[PDB]
A paper describes a structure:
Activating transcription factor 2 (ATF2) is ubiquitously expressed in most cell types and regulates the transcription of various genes involved in a broad spectrum of cellular functions: cell growth, development and stress. Mitogen-activated protein kinases (MAPK) control transcription by phosphorylating TADs. In the present study, we explore the structural and mechanistic basis of ATF2 regulation by two MAPKs: JNK and p38. We showed that JNK and p38 bind to the ATF2 TAD through distinct regions.
We found that an intact Zn-finger partially overlapping with the D-motif is the minimal JNK binding domain of ATF2. In addition, we set out to determine the crystal structure of the JNK-ATF2 complex using the ATF2(19–58)_Q34R/H47R construct that bound to JNK1 ~100-fold stronger compared to wild-type. The crystal structure showed that M51, L53, and F55 from the ATF2 D-motif bind in the hydrophobic pockets, while K48 binds in the negatively charged CD groove. Zn-finger residues also make contacts to JNK1 and mutations of these (K48, V44, H47 or Q34) greatly affected binding. Furthermore, arginine replacements at position 34 and 47 increased binding by creating additional H-bonds at the JNK:Zn-finger interface. The new crystallographic model provides the structure of the biologically relevant JNK1-ATF2 complex. In addition to making extra contacts, the Zn-finger in the ATF2 TAD contributes to the binding energy by decreasing the entropic cost of binding in the MAPK D-groove. Interestingly, the ATF2_CACA construct (in which the Zn-finger structure is disrupted) bound p38 better compared to wild-type while JNK binding decreased. This suggests that the Zn-finger limits the capacity of the partially overlapping D-motif to bind to p38 and favors JNK binding. The Zn-finger+D-motif module is more JNK-specific compared to an NFAT4-type D-motif, and specificity is achieved through both positive and negative factors that promote JNK- and limit p38-binding, respectively.
Author numbering:
A (entry chain C): 22 to 57
B (entry chain A): 3 to 175, 188 to 362
Write the structure that this text describes.
């Protein structure tokens, strides 16, 4: 009964709120670079 | 000789030798500390990568014995996205008379936070990382575990910017992320750890260690020059300490946080970056405070404008850990008791 769905491969996560899915998709898109 | 030592093989990494379960292949140096090397490996059964950490004689003395037994039972029973998880633990030795080495198999991460802190970071990365520590710290406090010594080298992150705290801190009783309340021997509470998120946040913005103190005296002084000498109402704990190094230590008024973390350190790219610089410097203002009376809580820091962009109940309200041992922080044994105590932890 939770219609808003994240599309990331391996994540079947669903959101009942539009804004709440927005930060979830942004969380998948993050990256960082480092130097040993 | 033995059916059981046909389950192990040995690989040399520097002067260290790893005798591990033959499922663990392709061992490689991925980091080091004072306890030695940690390795990447492939788990042929799990068909995934792992980190493998060796403890050589965890019971050499009593404080190390308590720290090994403590990190073992807790990693055994803390399951959280932002806490490092134990995949296996083993020993290659065949009995307790021969028991010597302990190997912890944990999840494999990309680097530690020192390799990010030296980097350049936008508000979205910084706040996302700190939010992740606050979720890990909050999970620990649910079960009663006050870390008291978080540091960037014992936190690892991955290239998708996820973060896991490696250790659980000191048992109840370089100081650069140590709060005033534990460096001056007062009592402490859960928000002792907020101070250390404060030094790491500050470290991420400025670019280098905020309060790098050469001694135990230089570490308190290098705090008060920046933050100013604390208030008379704060002078608690022992009365010898009250006069000690403080009442006439040369009076210090700290600098403003507009002056400690100037807009030079942040990017004024947009209005959005002008707003995030403002919010962050305000969050610092509430964590880098000497008197814990006036220091923010973890729950309040998680509901802060700089940090609450990422809020979601999934990871902020997890099921708290079930520590099987309650006297864990108060057990006191002999080296032989600790040895057998650590052994049967590895062996059940
Ligand atoms: N699971 C892991 N994944 C990736 N890197 C790791 C992992 N465990 C440790 N490392 C790296 O290896 C270093 C040593 O790990 P660490 O467990 O801190 O050893 P240590 O510093 O000697 N013991 P401690 O005093 O408990 O911090 C860390 O600082 C990381 O850079
Ligand atoms: Mg360390
Ligand atoms: Mg440790
Ligand atoms: Zn997802």
């Amino acid at each position: 009964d939770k219609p808003f769905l994240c599309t990331a491969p391996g994540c079947g996560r669903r959101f009942t709120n539009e804004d709440h899915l927005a930060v979830h998709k942004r969380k998948h898109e993050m990256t960082l670079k480092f130097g040993p | 000789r033995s059916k059981r030592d046909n389950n192990f093989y040995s690989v040399e990494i520097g002067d260290s030798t790893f005798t591990v379960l033959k499922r663990y292949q392709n061992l490689k140096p991925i980091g080091s500390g004072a306890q030695g090397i940690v390795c990447a490996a492939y788990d042929a059964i799990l068909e995934r990568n792992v980190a493998i950490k060796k403890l050589s004689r965890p019971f050499q003395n009593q404080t190390h014995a308590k720290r090994a037994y403590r990190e073992l039972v807790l990693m055994k029973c803390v399951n959280h996205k932002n806490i490092i998880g134990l995949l296996n633990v083993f020993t290659p030795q065949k009995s307790l008379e021969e028991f010597q080495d302990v190997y912890i198999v944990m999840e494999l991460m990309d680097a530690n936070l020192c390799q990010v802190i030296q980097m350049e970071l936008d508000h979205e990365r910084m706040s996302y990382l700190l939010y992740q520590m606050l979720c890990g710290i909050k999970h620990l406090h649910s079960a009663g575990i006050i870390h008291r010594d978080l540091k960037p080298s014992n936190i690892v992150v991955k290239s998708d910017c996820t973060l896991k705290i490696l250790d659980f801190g000191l048992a109840r009783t370089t100081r650069y992320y140590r709060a005033p309340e534990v460096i001056l021997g007062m009592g402490y509470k859960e928000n002792v750890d907020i101070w250390s998120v404060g030094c790491i946040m500050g470290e991420m913005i400025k670019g280098g260690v905020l309060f790098p103190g050469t001694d135990h005296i230089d570490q308190w002084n290098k705090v008060i020059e920046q933050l100013g000498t604390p208030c008379p109402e704060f002078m608690k704990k022992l009365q010898p300490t009250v006069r000690t190094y403080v009442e006439n230590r040369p009076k210090y008024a700290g600098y403003s946080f507009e002056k400690l973390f100037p807009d030079v350190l942040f990017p004024a790219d947009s209005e959005h970056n002008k707003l995030k610089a403002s919010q962050a410097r305000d969050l610092l203002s509430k964590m880098l405070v000497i008197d814990a009376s006036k220091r923010i809580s973890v729950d309040e820091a998680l509901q802060h404008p700089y940090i609450n962009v990422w809020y979601d109940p999934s990871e902020a309200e997890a099921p708290p850990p079930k520590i099987p041992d309650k006297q864990l922080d108060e057990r006191e044994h002999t080296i032989e008791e600790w040895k057998e105590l650590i052994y049967k932890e590895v062996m059940d």
